[PDB]
Amino acid sequence: SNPYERGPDPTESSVTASRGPFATTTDSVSSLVSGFGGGTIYYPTDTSEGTFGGVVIAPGYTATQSSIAWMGHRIASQGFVVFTIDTNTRYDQPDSRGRQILAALDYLTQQSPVRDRVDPNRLAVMGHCMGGGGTLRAAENRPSLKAAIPLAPWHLQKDWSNVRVPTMIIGCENDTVASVSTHAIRFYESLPSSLPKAYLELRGADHFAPNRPNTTIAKYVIAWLKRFVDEDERYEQFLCPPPDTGLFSDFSDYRDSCP
């Protein structure tokens, strides 16, 4: 038995939906909170199935939470507590984002209005651009985390062989800000070979593809969160077998660790 399973058995239809089975609302967190620059918490209103996994998502350089908010209701409604932060300033570098992600996690589980709805043992980190570099760092530093999902990441450190948290890196094929050959793929290729991982490269997408609703991104994000945060093997169908990487797919490349 698995007590962390939430919601009905998933179909192609459910993973690609813009709103999953759970109704959601939001709490605001002011910038005067310490360790970061505030943000919005998206969470399910139904308590009857149990507590949910927690997820912090962080933006990129020069950007705010507006650039990631689409992920809030989208992911929370599949059965998660999702925290979209702002960083102290818009110009904080990756490792600083990393500190701040870690701080928003602690705030979510220890002090927020919705702490009583979050399982403090089941957490994940995601981010975009430098926020994704920060995501890598957070996972390097807090190996108790269940999942890490860097979107179009940027970081000067290329070697992430010390990461031990299941990691799905999502690259954008035509990224000229954080080109996949000097960022995303270098990171993926350095991950230990024993570690559950995946690299998704979106065909013909630019660097900002993560900042607007994207059905492909949402499906594999929801699946990776589900599989490792909730331990839920009902979502392994969407991860293995891997999908196709022809010119007739949304993916220009896909690497994995299957079975």
Resolution (A): 2.7
Pick from 76, 53, 71, 105: nearest CA to 227: 53
Spell 42-54 as b/e; 16+ CB within 10 A means b. bbbeeeeeebbbb
- Written as six digits, the tokens of 108 are 């979510």
The domain spanning residue 230 has which CATH number? 3.40.50.1820
Hey, what amino acid is at 250?
A: D
Q: For the beta carbon of residue 66, count every other beta carbon within 10 angstroms.
A: 11
> Is 9 inside any structural domain?
no
Report how far apart, in Å, the C-alpha atoms of 138 and of each of 50, 94, 116 are: 27, 10, 23
> Is 5 inside any structural domain?
no
Upstream peptide bond of 259 is cis (omega within 30 degrees of 0): yes
> Is 50 inside any structural domain?
yes
Chain position carrying tokens 């890196």: 169
How would DSSP label each residue in 73-100? HHHHTTT-EEEEEPPSSTT--HHHHHHH
Report how far apart, in Å, the C-alpha atoms of 129 and of each of 37, 41, 208 are: 17, 21, 9
DSSP state of 204: T
User: What's the CA gap between 221 and 71, in Å, rounded?
Assistant: 10
End-to-end CA distance of the chain: 21
> Maximum CA pair distance of the chain?
48
Task: Spell out where 173-250 has E strands.
Answer: 197-202
> Is 93 inside any structural domain?
yes
Pick from 59, 256, 68: nearest CA to 168: 256
Contact (CB, 8 A) for 78 and 22 = yes
Contact (CB, 8 A) for 188 and 164 = no
- Written as six digits, the tokens of 198 are 């995946």
* Method used experimentally: X-ray
> Is 13 inside any structural domain?
no
Upstream peptide bond of 242 is cis (omega within 30 degrees of 0): no
Structural domain count, the chain = 1
Write out the residue range of the structural domain in which residue 228 sits.
42-256
Contact (CB, 8 A) for 149 and 84 = no
> Is 66 inside any structural domain?
yes
- 218: Cβ–Cβ under 8 A, 6 or more apart, which residues? 15, 16, 18, 71, 74, 75
> Is 11 inside any structural domain?
no
Contact (CB, 8 A) for 241 and 159 = no
Beta-bridge mates of residue 24: 44
- 245: Cβ–Cβ under 8 A, 6 or more apart, which residues? 251, 252, 253, 254
User: What's the CA gap between 36 and 134, in Å, rounded?
Assistant: 13
> Is 24 inside any structural domain?
no
- Written as six digits, the tokens of 7 are 């919601």
3-state SS, residue 172: strand
How far is Cα of residue 190 from the mean position of the Cα atoms in its chain? 19
Hey, what amino acid is at 60?
A: G
Sheet holding 81-85, edge to edge: 24-29, 39-44, 81-85, 52-58, 118-129, 147-153, 167-172, 197-202, 251-256
- Written as six digits, the tokens of 35 are 């360790």
